[PDB]
Amino acid sequence: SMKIDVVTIFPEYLQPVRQSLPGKAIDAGLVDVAVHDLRRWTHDVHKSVDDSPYGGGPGMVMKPTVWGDALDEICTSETLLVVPTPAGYPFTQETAWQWSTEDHLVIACGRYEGIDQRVADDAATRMRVREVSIGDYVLNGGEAAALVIIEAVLRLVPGVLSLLEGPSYTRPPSWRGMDVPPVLLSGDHAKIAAWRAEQSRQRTIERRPDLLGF
Amino acid sequence: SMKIDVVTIFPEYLQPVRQSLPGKAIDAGLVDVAVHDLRRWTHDVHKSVDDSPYGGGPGMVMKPTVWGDALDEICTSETLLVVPTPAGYPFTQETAWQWSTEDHLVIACGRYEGIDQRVADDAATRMRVREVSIGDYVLNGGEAAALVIIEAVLRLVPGVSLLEGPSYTRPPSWRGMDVPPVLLSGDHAKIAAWRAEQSRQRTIERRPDLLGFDS
Ligand SMILES: Nc1ncnc2[nH]cnc12
Numbered sequence: 468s469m470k471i472d473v474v475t476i477f478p479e480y481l482q483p484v485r486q487s488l489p490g491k492a493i494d495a496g497l498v499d500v501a502v503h504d505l506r507r508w509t510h511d512v513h514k515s516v517d518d519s520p521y522g523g524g525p526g527m528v529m530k531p532t533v534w535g536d537a538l539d540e541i542c543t544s545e546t547l548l549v550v551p552t553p554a555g556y557p558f559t560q561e562t563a564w565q566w567s568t569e570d571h572l573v574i575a576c577g578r579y580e581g582i583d584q585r586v587a588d589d590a591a592t593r594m595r596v597r598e599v600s601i602g603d604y605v606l607n608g609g610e611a612a613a614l615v616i617i618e619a620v621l622r623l624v625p626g627v628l629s630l631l632e633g634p635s636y637t638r639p640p641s642w643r644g645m646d647v648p649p650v651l652l653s654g655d656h657a658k659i660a661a662w663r664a665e666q667s668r669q670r671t672i673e674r675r676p677d678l679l680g681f
Numbered sequence: 682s683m684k685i686d687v688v689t690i691f692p693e694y695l696q697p698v699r700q701s702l703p704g705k706a707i708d709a710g711l712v713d714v715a716v717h718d719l720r721r722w723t724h725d726v727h728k729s730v731d732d733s734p735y736g737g738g739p740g741m742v743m744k745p746t747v748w749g750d751a752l753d754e755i756c757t758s759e760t761l762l763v764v765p766t767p768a769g770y771p772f773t774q775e776t777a778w779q780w781s782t783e784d785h786l787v788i789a790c791g792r793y794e795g796i797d798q799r800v801a802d803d804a805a806t807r808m809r810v811r812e813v814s815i816g817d818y819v820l821n822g823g824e825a826a827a828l829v830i831i832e833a834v835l836r837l838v839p840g841v842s843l844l845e846g847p848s849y850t851r852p853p854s855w856r857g858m859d860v861p862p863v864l865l866s867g868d869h870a871k872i873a874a875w876r877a878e879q880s881r882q883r884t885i886e887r888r889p890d891l892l893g894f895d896s
């Protein structure tokens with residue numbers, strides 16, 4: 468059974484919710500998710516987790532001594548350490564598939580300005596480390612990115628459940644002046660597949676022209 | 682202040698949390714976030730919100746009747762209706778900046794197989810509709826994408842390119858690993874040059890697309 472440890476300064480934000488796909492996976496015994504308050508590994512009364520960046524600049528950088536202790540305790544040699552960061556390699560469906568068969572994911576959630584690079588560099592000498600971005604936008608921290616990664620990965624674990632997908636329809640056949648495309652009701656399943664391919668092509672050209680090569 | 686309405690069959694999941702960035706924005710009176718259970722607009726015993734797809738295929742498609750009623754109540758002509766879908770236009774930083782000035786966002790969260798397309802088509806005859814993907818992966822539903830969109834947008838609300846290279850903080854040596862000496866030198870010019878170089882070098886390795894290269 469997969470183990471996922473999430474380390475964050477926002478533990479209640481990342482607490483699993485029963486009424487959700489990860490909540491369902493947990494209650495099904497298909498994953499164990501544990502959320503850890505990073506402050507647990509702080510050294511001082513202020514529970515300090517970041518510090519000013521060397522070289523100057525706005526924002527803060529998360530402390531290596533704090534993260535170092537947290538990961539020392541939580542990780543083992545089998546761990547895949549996931550570090551969400553907008554400077555990461557792209558997280559894709561392929562990645563989600565790879566991680567879905569891992570025994571132990573640890574997701575280190577930090578502010579977007581980053582965790583001191585030595586944490587990942589050190590960790591990588593003992594375990595596999597993956598710095599990943601979930602998209603071309605900036606979140607204040609990796610917390611919401613962790614939620615996305617967990618959702619994408621867990622729905623691929625057995626038992627939990629190119630081109631763009633085109634429009635989909637269901638009952639009633641007519642609604643507010645709009646009819647479901649009659650081909651879908653034709654019982655000509657080869658034709659339906661061809662029609663769906665064309666819908667997919669048109670939607671991809673319109674919304675994601677990057678996916679068509681060219 | 683900005684109003685965000687979220688419609689979902691997972692209200693508990695989407696409930697704002699005080700200790701979070703959106704929680705801070707709410708507490709500061711800079712945004713009002715309301716979460717609505719889609720089942721509120723069902724009429725049948727079983728509170729059904731989806732049905733098998735016309736034409737076949739896996740999973741289920743969300744009923745247009747239920748969504749139609751929900752949006753009729755929540756949306757006005759001024760609403761920007763956001764519909765997260767993996768089949769959507771890309772949601773980007775530019776999008777976040779644009780939506781940070783909107784008076785009213787409504788985020789319609791639905792399973793990935795889709796809300797019946799007639800819903801978005803109908804809505805578009807009355808208001809601005811934006812079907813958007815937050816990345817090239819599949820989530821079971823729009824819920825976690827809504828959380829991401831709310832995060833990306835609210836941090837840009839007043840009052841609340843290239844990849845950034847590595848960052849460092851104290852102490853200067855840790856487990857035998859030293860902070861790059863230029864960063865300790867106080868030479869703003871050399872530091873800026875070093876950071877620019879690290880940025881370009883990380884970008885070419887991790888995101889060559891950003892510099893107009895393949896992959
Ligand atoms: N786009 C992003 N991806 C992963 N982690 C992040 N933290 C802040 N923004 C992020």
Ligand SMILES: Nc1ncnc2[nH]cnc12
Nearest residue numbers: 765766814815820822826
């Ligand atoms: N990648 C994605 N972006 C937006 N909404 C989604 N719903 C399921 N997957 C999604």
